[PDB]
């Protein structure tokens, strides 16, 4: 299928990358319940290519910025990234 995973590099403890150059990167909202965030299950992430079943990292707390490669526009890095706003419900 279209992909597997993206933020397996940095998700639970991303720190921060970018914030300069062209506006390649994007913003989305990732809806996740408390136990799927704790264990790291799955949720649906909405991107430029439509929906993707993205496997949540372990020990995710509300406000983490997950990073989906190729789901932003090509620019400074050549590949824009989609910043997922994790929402614990």
Curated annotation (Swiss-Prot):
Cysteines paired by S-S bonds: none
Subcellular location: Cytoplasm
Family: Belongs to the DnaJ family.
The protein's role, per its UniProt record: Does not influence ATP binding or hydrolysis nor ADP release. Exerts influence on the interaction of DnaK with substrates; in the presence of DafA, DnaJ inhibits substrate binding, and substrate already bound to DnaK is displaced by DnaJ and DafA.
Complex and partners: Forms a heterononamer with DnaJ and DafA in the resting state. Three copies of each protein are present in the complex.
Protein's recorded name: Chaperone protein DnaJ 2
Organism of this sequence: Thermus thermophilus (strain ATCC 27634 / DSM 579 / HB8)
Lineage: Bacteria, Thermotogati, Deinococcota, Deinococci, Thermales
Name of the gene encoding the protein in the UniProt record: dnaJ2
Section of the entire sequence shown: 191 to 256 of 280
